[PDB]
Every structure is written in C-alpha cells, then in structure tokens.
Point group: C5
Chain length 321, copies 5
C-alpha cells in the first residue's frame, strides 16, 4: 500500500560541487552554513536562494562577512539573510537544469558548508543512467559536479542528514476536507479519484512541475474537467508503481503556491512538501525547521483570508526521528 | 482502568511565544532560566509568576541583572526570586485567557529560556480545532504565539522536558483516610463515589477551575450535599472516558488551596498536581523539584495545624526516571 | 531464603538537612566532601564524626580551610581529618536521636556536599508513619530536615549512591569458625541457632543497639545462657520476616567492638557492616573504601593478638559492581 | 559461494617499519599523515608514492615542512602533495620486493603516522612461513621491519583501520555489459567463463601482476584466445578455493590500466580495487576516499573517449559502514 | 578440558604497597608509570626491574627526573629506561620472597603509579590462608603491604587491568614441531606425554621455578630420562586439577631462557608467558605490548642461530580484546 509518495522513488543521489564566488569564499573561510533552495522558472532553468542564520555569524568577523553579503542584494527578515542567485550569478545553472529535465528527478533542499554545495535528489531507477551520463558529459577540466552517493533511496529524510542540517526537523500535517471549493484539479467529486503529489522543485516561479502518482483506476482527463487549474494540462507518462500511474505534470493548485510565496517573503521555507488526495480530502505534509513553525499561524491566517471558502485544519505538529 | 487522570487527555500541545519586556531581554542576553507559573483570577484572566534561582545568576553580571529584576517588585526567599506579571505588564494575557476558556485545556508549568516562552497544555481532542483557531486568529491581531507541538498526549511528564527543565523531578504522594471531616465535596460517605481531579491552572486566586473525572455511577449532585465546598456548584459537561463522566467544575476544597497558598508564600511550587478519591479515601500527587521538598515538613506542619482533624500521611517520595 | 539481613528492611529513606556552622560554610564554598559517621552513646543520643581527605583540600585555600577545621579539635591521621560534632546531647530539639529511637531504623553512612548533609536510613514499613511524623514535628521546632526519598528499600548499596560517594567500594568477608571461644552470644553450641545482625548505628560508644534476625526455631533465652555478652539482655520484638523473628537488642560481642575502635583510632571506618551466624560459624561482612583496606592487615594483627583463641580468616576481598 | 575475491585470502598481516629520511622526521615531529601507495615496475621491484593532504599541514610550521618536501621533487595537484620514493631513496625496497615475490601476497594501501610505516598484506596461509622467514632473514641484515599482526584475514576493510585512515571510505561499482569489444581477456564470449581478479600491487608501471580466481570449469587458455591482452600469458598455479582455481598471472586489460594512470596524474588513487567477470559482464569495484569521487566524472569521461565502444555505467556509490 | 594453564589457578590476589625511595617520590610527584618485573635468584629472593618509557617523561621536568634516575645505574635502550632494584635498595624484598615461597603462587607483571606499587598473583585456593597470614604477620613487623583484591581468578588478563596498563596488549604464539632435538624435558618421544607450564616468576637468574600441569597418565620420571634439562630434578606435588597433576618444579629448558635474556638485554619483556607440550609439539604463548613486537624478528633470528636444529614458526600475532 502506497502512503508517502517517497515510496515510488527507488533511487537517490547526493550531488556535490563548488562554484567560486565571494559567498563561497566566506562560507569556507568562516565555517558558515547556507541552506540552498532550488527554484525553477517558466523555462525550467534552475536557480538558487541562499539562506543564512544571522545569529550563526561569528561576531569577530561580522563586518567583513556583512560587506560581502550586501553585494548580493540581500533581504534580511526574521533573523535570516536571503540572497537570490540568478542564472548568471550562478555558473552551475546549466548542469542542474539538465538534471531537472530528467523526468523523475526530484530536487530536495540543498546546503553549502566548507565551501562545498550538497544537493540531494530522489528519482526512479530507469532514469539513473541519464543522470550519470549528464554528470559525465558535463565534466570538463577543473571543478566538476560529482556524486557523493548514488543508489537506493534511503528516504526523503536522509536528504536532511546528507546536507548536514543539524537543526531539529518538524512534521506539519494540514487537512482540507472541502478542496472542491477551489475547483481545478479538485473539481471532480463523483469519481473516487486518488493521488499523491510532490514537486520536482521545492520553489518555483510562474510554473508547475510535479510528480503525480495517480491510482490507475482513473486518468488525467478525469481530473482536468475545467480550466481553473494552475499551469498547463501537459503530462509525461513515467511508468507504474503497483496500482499507481506515475506522471510528470505541469498543472497544480493556487493554495500551495500562495503558501510558498508568503513564506519565502518572510525568508522561511520548508525542507520538503508533498500532498495526498483521496475520498475528496486533501492532505498537505510539510517538513520544516522551527523558523517555519513560528510563522505558521500568520501564514494560515493569510491563506484562509485569500481562500475564505476553504476549511483548513492543523492535524498535528510533531518533532521528527 | 483509569489511574492517572492524565489518561483522559488524549491531546497535548506546546505553545511558544515572545513578549518584549526587560525581563525577556536579560534572559536571552545572559542565558537565564525562568519557570513561569500560570495563575488565574476570579474573572478567569491568565497571568504569570516568574521564578528565578538566585544561584543561577552569573556573578559578573549580577549588578545589571538585579537592577532589572528590582523594577518588577520582586520577592526574594529561599534562594528564589519571585516576580508577578499582572495583565497590564503582560501583553499576551488575552490569548492565553482565550486558550484557558476552552473547556478541556489544562495549563502545565511553563518556562522561559533564550528569551522564548514555552507553555505546555493538555486537553481532549474535540477541543483541538478551537485551540488552533484562536492561535491563528490571535496571529491576525499581531500576536506571535505559535505551536512547537500539537498531537497525542505524550504524558504530563513530557511537559517537563518540553520546557527544558533539567532539574531532578520528584513524585510526592499524600494520603488522607478521613477526608469527610472536611465535608464539602467529601461529605457523602454512604455512596461509593469515585473520581479523579486536576486543575486547569496550577495556581489560582479566589477561584476554582477543575477537570473532574467522575465514575458515571454517580452525578455531581451526589457530591454536592452541603454548602461547605469552596467555589461554585456550576459545571460544564465535557464528555465520557470509558466509564467516567468528564466535567469542568468550579468547586474544590480548602486543604489543597491552603497548601498552594503556603508554598508560594515561600517562593516554591509544584510542577503538577492531581488527586484521586475512592473508597472514602483521598490521594494527593505532587510532581516537584527539590525546592518544594525542603519545605514539605513545614508545609505539612502548617496544614495539619489548620486542619487538625485530618489524618495526613506521606505515602511516598520518589525520584522520577 | 534470607541471606543478607538487608532483606528484612522493606523501606528506605534519604534524610537531608543543613547544619548552620562554619564547617558547613567551607564545605559549600570550596566544594568539599565530608563523610559523616553516625555515632550513639549510652543514652542513645546521636552524634557525628566528620571525615575529610587532606589531599582533597584545594591548596589555594588551605590556610582558610585549616583555620576553620582546627576550631573543632581535629585529629589528623593517615591523610584524614577526623572531627567530632555534637549538636543534640544538650538542647531541646534532638531530631536524629528521635529517628534513631524508632525501633527498626538503621542509620547508614552519611555525607556532606554542597553545604547539604545526606543521611540514608533503612527500616521496616510499619515504622514509616512514626518517622514521617517526627520529621514533621521536628520542622515545628525550627529544624530544616527533610526527605529526598522515602519508599521501598533500594538496597544498602543504594545508600552509597545517595550520599554521592564516588570512590570505589569493596566488600570484605571475614569468617570465624570457632566463635564459641568468646562465649557470650556464641556460648550455645548444641542448638542449631541461626541469625543475622546489623547495628542501628555504624559507630557507638559504650553501648549496643542491634537489629537481630533470629531463625524462629529459637528464642533470645536460647542465646543468652551466660553473662559474658557485652551490653544488656534487653530486647524489643519488632516482628516477623518469613521464618525469622526480628528484634531490637542491646547485647553484642567484644570482637566487633574492638575492630571498630581500632579502625576509628586510625581515622578510617566502614560504610556498612553486618554479620551472619549459622552452623556454629560466624561471618563478618564489611563494605568500605580503600583507606580501610590499607589498614586491614594491621587491624587483623591487633584483633588476633587481643583474641588469641579465635581463628580468623579473610574469605574474600572484592570490588563492588 | 565466492563473491568478493577477498574470500580466497584466509590470511592477513600488518607490516610495520621505520626508514631514516627527512620525510619520516617531519611526519613524526608534526603529527602528519601520509598515505603510501605501493608500486611495482617491470622487474617487480617495490617502490612507493607518498600522498599528503595540503590542508593537513599546520600553518605554524608550513615553511619548514615545505622546504623538506620540495627536496623530493613533489607534484602538487588537487590540494595533494605527491612524492615518488625510488628504490635508492627508499632503503627498505629490498625486503618489500621479497614479500611481493611470494605468490599469494597482495599489498594494500599503506600509511605513515608518528614516523612509523604501516603496510597491510593479504595472502593464502600456504605462504605464511615464507613471509615470516623473510621478515626474520631481512631482520638479520638489519632489524627494522616487524609484524603488528599476522593471522586470519579480518577483511580488506580492516586494512583501512590498520593504517589508521580516519576518512570516510566509499564503495564505487562500475559495470560494463559489453567488455568483449576490448577483446583480450574478454574475447571469449561463447563459453560461460567466470572469474574474480585483484592486483598484487595497487599501482604498477609497465607490468601486470594479478591474482585471478577462475571457475575451474575452464583453464587460462580458454581466456587467452587472441593476442590483444596486456602483459604476458604466463601464470603460476597457487591452488584451489572451493570450485575456483587460483593463479598468479601476468596479463590484464588496458581499461583498468588507463583509469589508474589518469587518476594518479591527478594525485588521487583508490585504497582497493578488484573485478568480477561473469555472464559476459565486467564489474569493477573501487574503495576510495572523497578525493577520488570528485574526479570520477573527469576520469570516466576520459575512459569513455579512449574506449568509445565500451558501455560503462555507475551501478552504485555508497559510503561504507 | 584444560587449554590455558590459567585454568588450574582458581584464585587471584592484588597486592599493593609503598616503599620509600627517590624513585617512588618522583613517580608520585610527576604522575609517572613504571612497569615492575619480578625477578628471582638461585636462593629464590625476589627483586625487581623497573621499566620507564622515555617519551612518558614530561619535558618540563626531564632534568630533575633524569638526575634521580641516573643515581640507580639505569640502562637506556629502545626508548626505555631499565633499572635494577637489588634486595638492599628494595626493603620489601623479604615479604615478597615469603609470598613466592608459597608453592602455587605465580607472580604476574606489576606496576607503580601514584607512588603505589601493584602486584597481581595467581594461585590455588588451598594456599589462600598461607598468603593472607604472611601478609598479616608482615604487617606486624611494620610492613604496609595490603590487599586490593583476593578471591576467584578473574584471569591472567585481568592482571593487566589491575596494574593500570593502558597500552594495547598482543598475543604471540610460537610453535616448535621438533623440540626433542633439545633433549632434556623433550627427550621422551615414545610416550604420549602432555603438559602445560607457567613460571612462578616472569624473570629469573640462574634458576628454575615452574608450575607444571602434567596429564596424570605419566609421572615426572617419565619426563626426566636424561641429564640435559636446565635446573634440578626436584618437585613439590601441589594437587590435582581434573586429570592433571600439578607440580612446582625446578627444571626447565634453555630455549625459553635464551629468549628471556636476549629480550631483557634490549629493555623489553613480556607481561606473561606460558607453554603447552602435546603430541611431541611445543607451543609458546607470549602476552606483550608493542615494544616486544618490534624486536621479535631479531630475537627469533638470534634464537634460531643459537638453536640451529630447532624448527621455529610464528603461528599468530593478534591484538587482545
Ligand atoms: Ca484503484
Ligand atoms: Ca461505577
Ligand atoms: Ca530453623
Ligand atoms: Ca564451474
Ligand atoms: Ca591421560
Ligand atoms: Cl505537493
Ligand atoms: Cl487536584
Ligand atoms: Cl554486625
Ligand atoms: Cl582488478
Ligand atoms: Cl613457560
């Protein structure tokens, strides 16, 4: 029986690399820790947000570090520095865009420590050779993206360990018992449609790029009966897991998008998100550090006011493992 | 079979928040630890007592710390600073009063560390949505209260861990084999009445606000035969647990009130208290640190002299694993 | 089957208190550790010997500490300071003497650390209420003695942990196969008399105060057939454990007394001692730190010369786990 | 059933020694760590490459250390100092060549720490007395080399522990499903030939010296059907393990040779390598630290281009437990 | 079934003491560690060699320490200081000689730390009272020797722990398949003689003093058929263990003697040695630290050349768990 969609991904890899740039120098120089949030745009180009805890800056060196950070047009909020690395500011943007283009590849939250970037990905083993080959083709003289791990999926939660995140992680579960109120992918209420979903990219800009696991009793047209979904109707059939059809899909919902843009405007984000739809009920699962927890009340207040017809509950908030 | 009344509470939450005030500033600045004792008045408004161990003040910074503490009209006794935060000095008094008003909510001992307040609550799951909603509504008014945990009750003793209390906790058991000499809720000796009890607030001022679990063989009128109980006869029916009726009730006894009033006058208090009544016999259970233990002999001497007909034993004092 | 007499004691308590006195001030001020040996005199007044390791005195503060110690008429020997402290023999309040007077109460070795004394006692549960009541009454006379533990007997060896003794403890077993040559309580050789014994006080002066567990096949008169025992013939019947009659008794033997006075004249002592008599054979069990071990050869040499008809063996010396 | 060829080696030894030379002096004086790679030439003379992490040089003494290192004609690349110790610069070259000449002896990666050299070897118990005797004879000519261990094979992975390598080790698995396109030892595709292989020396120069374990259904001539193998056709029969014939053999393949020369030109190397051939498929197993991993993409790119007909996959990269 | 001769020794004791001498003062003063090797002469008087690791001398205090050491005519070799303490300089020589004279007593390696000497012994329980009595009698002459342990044998390897040896211990096994070429105790080859052996003293001078465990199928005259053994034919029958006769015996072999004198001339020694003879094969077992291992090749080279007819093998060298 398929519960967490993580179960359809039989493979996992830990990508590693270095790009030289003043942020990297100080990271290595002063033992700093960055969280690196992958973001895709409408043309599926990969970029990154960088997050730095203000209180993790050694006071001895604050002056030098701040002067380097300020060159990158930072936003400081809730004790967190947020820096955007556009395609140009981020030389490695072209290999990561290639990896992303491999259908079953799901990007997890990354990090930078000791000047080295770590990015976990989860995927389906048929795509393993394509991933390996683009890493090898990409290889030139000098610094190359490489593999610290590739093999069976150790779990989405291993990704947190792989990137050296030491902070306590929490699991948040939200439930929405009347999602049909939003129409779109929730419009069909008579067929017992059931699916699981996880984004290929944790953050995105004017686009959708999801892995849907759909109970094969139904097809995509059973879901898309109106024009109120976000993104586009297009899909790519990936394969089967048990009694589920796996799709890469370019449509989504506005509620998850809203929550994402509100939270990043507060310089916080989740490490992982996936959702479950069955029996006409929507479940949202977030894995986060405490920063996100502080803002949950405000974020849900905003989300409720922007989606006033939606019934939205917190099922539970639990520390993990 | 229901032993500890904790068993009727299937849910638990850890509330967290911050309020700006000089006490908060020094706590964060100098790594201090406060215990925060919730107190309700007759109008069911929540306030707090703050407790600080004198020997936990770093001596280098004592001068600055003491000058801040003295602005809050402190009482110093038995090596402990006691500070009262009235509704006015304590901005967050209105959300917590709202939480308290939710029938099954029981406040545990709170703390403050790193400038952040932690307050555990235990409750019955039917009231979960009401609690969450007032937290979210509160966030719409500016308030920064949030949840570090909400889900199954991990136990009253998890609360001690949640608030980061590192001190050894002890369990004290008192027994009273002739409570009927106090009359009030103990006046009925003919019926095999049985119940468990725990206060919704650890401390209170001229009021009673209890959760009673009453063996459903009997009703509240079976207990209230005279007018010698403390508080008021009023109740709110909450629901059923096994063969027990659960009530919120506004009546109590003078003996427990006396003990509470004596011990706080000595700047000590328990972390948790509940009681059991069955076979005409009363049991009192206290969970405390060593400060309270030092004063148990004096407190019981006082209690005996004020209630000279009552037979009062120490059944057990044990450290908790 | 009853082996260690510890098995007849179903209860245990850890007494705690403070002596207001300069020895207390320096103990707390300079993180010293005292062993506190309870001693009774002929009138059953409890006093204490205080033991301090000379090499545990921080030299930076030796001058101040020595000047305080010398006010108490110390004896220094084998690197150990020995001080006699009498508080109860004169004034009104005499709490430890009162506890001792409770029949089944057995005092273990105490300690003083962080300005607080810890004193374990073992006893039989029928006497629990009497102990608690005198502690509560004692608090009405000013006295600050309280309970850090009261409940089941965790074992004589828990007492060592309770008083925060970190030193390695050793078990010494002596056997005497011809104790009848001393007469007294060993005079009767024709009846299959069997008993266990432990003193209510680890040290004593011109008195005996024992708990005897006697196989109920026999009575006290079966033992006392001559006049050559030490102390008095008097007993108080305490109760039954299995097939053993429990007595408080005021008679003993000269050999155990001799060993005690020799070793304390050398400023060393055991943490616990008990004995077994069966099949006309005597066993002595000592629990001690290494200080006592160093002097065992000399002490046994002395004991043999003072009791030249006695055959005395070391059965075993083992570290305790 | 034989999986890892390590299973044919029932014996293992840890050789230890000291040679006087300035590299040894600084190694001991400043707590440096060298990896030492045994290398053989066409005349089977053993030499060593020395590897030193640049970032492990204490900056305090960098000047002195670098001046000593530069006397040995170092190559610095990828943060690693590589130094070649030729037979004359390396007095102990005569005993180690003798050990190597013992047929079943396999050299593992060695290390130097605290001025002492550690070199693990794995072998078949048949050769134990010969190894011991040459150590004792070698001693007679000047005592230096000795044994820290000799007995059962604890495993190839124990060798990593023996040399005190603290770095995380990784297992890399490559598979080649069409090795027959290289001809040579892979030319025969019609017979169900199966074997395992491991080099007696981790690195080599213009020579081959392998242990082959060949399923005894076939013989060496069944493998060597053309003239396109590297090295020479010669073998020495060592014995049997289960259903496998063990040979020392002087032929190999060009692909593994290429990978070895490319990686050492980058100052990285594996700790261990072995290969498996069965069902027309070749498996290559590498055990390495992270330095090797960084260069895998470049190394495989080079290997693919020099062997364009070969299908080469990464099966797995896993950290070792 | 009897393997290690340690199995015949059911008892063990740890002797402890102090003798005043400048070596003792400095050991205590500077936290030094000595190994103390018991040695007997032809008159069975016990003396000691003292071993001190040069690199364990704190450089701060080297001058003072060396000046004290040099007064005792030290030999320095292989980084080790060796000092002989003759009977006169070693006041305690007379009690230890008495202990040694007790037939079943076996001396292990001793140590001195914190100015206190620790010496483990193993023996057979019938001799316990004799050992205890000479310790007690000794204490009547002034002597400060005492027992930190006496009871069942915890094993020869517990002795290493008792003396606070922190160094890694190794087990070396030698085998000699043709010991009859040395004649003496190995001359009889036609009877299936089997025995185990361990010296009562780890080192000795012109004497033999062994415990032999001889399979009781045979007697001592069955062994001694020629005059080519070392020492004397005399024995003392100790008793039985299973099917083995236990003897104290004053004859031995020249090969073990040679190895001992060569290794101590290099300032190294074993912690324990015993041997097994059965099926015409001799096994020698050594337990040692690494110092001895460094010199094994030289020692065996020397031993082979002095006994050219003897076939010697290293069976195994393993670290001890
Ligand atoms: Ca279905
Ligand atoms: Ca009922
Ligand atoms: Ca009986
Ligand atoms: Ca076959
Ligand atoms: Ca036999
Ligand atoms: Cl999702
Ligand atoms: Cl209560
Ligand atoms: Cl006794
Ligand atoms: Cl290979
Ligand atoms: Cl031997």
């Amino acid at each position: 029986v398929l519960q967490d969609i993580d179960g359809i991904f039989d493979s996992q890899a830990i990508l590693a690399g270095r790009f030289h740039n003043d942020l990297t120098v100080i990271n290595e120089k002063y033992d700093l820790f960055y969280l690196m949030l992958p973001t895709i745009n409408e043309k599926k180009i990969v970029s990154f947000y960088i997050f730095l805890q203000d209180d993790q800056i050694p006071e001895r060196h604050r002056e030098e570090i701040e002067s380097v950070l300020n060159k990158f047009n930072p936003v400081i909020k809730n004790g967190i520095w947020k820096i955007y690395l556009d395609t140009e500011s981020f030389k490695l943007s072209e290999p990561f865009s290639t990896f992303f283009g491999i259908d079953s590849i799901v990007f997890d939250m990354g990090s930078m420590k000791g000047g080295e970037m770590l990015l976990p990905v989860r995927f389906i083993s048929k795509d393993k050779d394509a991933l390996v080959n683009s890493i090898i083709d990409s290889a030139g003289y000098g610094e190359n993206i490489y593999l610290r791990y590739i093999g069976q999926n150790k779990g989405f939660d291993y990704s947190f360990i792989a990137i050296k995140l030491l902070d306590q992680v929490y699991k948040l579960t939200l439930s929405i018992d009347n999602p049909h109120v939003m129409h779109g992918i929730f419009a069909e209420t008579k067929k017992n449609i059931a699916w699981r979903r996880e984004s290929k990219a944790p953050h995105k800009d004017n686009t959708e790029d999801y892995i849907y696991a759909l109970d094969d009793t139904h097809t995509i047209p059973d879901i898309l009966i109106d024009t109120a979904y976000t993104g586009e109707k297009g899909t790519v059939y990936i394969g089967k897991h048990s009694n589920y059809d796996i799709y890469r899909a370019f449509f989504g919902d506005a509620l998850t998008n809203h929550m994402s843009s509100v939270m990043i405007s507060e310089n916080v984000y989740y490490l992982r998100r996936w959702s479950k739809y069955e029996d006409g009920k929507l479940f949202l699962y977030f894995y986060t550090t405490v920063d996100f927890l502080r803002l949950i009340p405000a974020i849900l207040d905003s989300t409720r006011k922007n989606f006033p017809k939606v019934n939205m509950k917190i099922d539970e908030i639990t520390p993990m493992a």
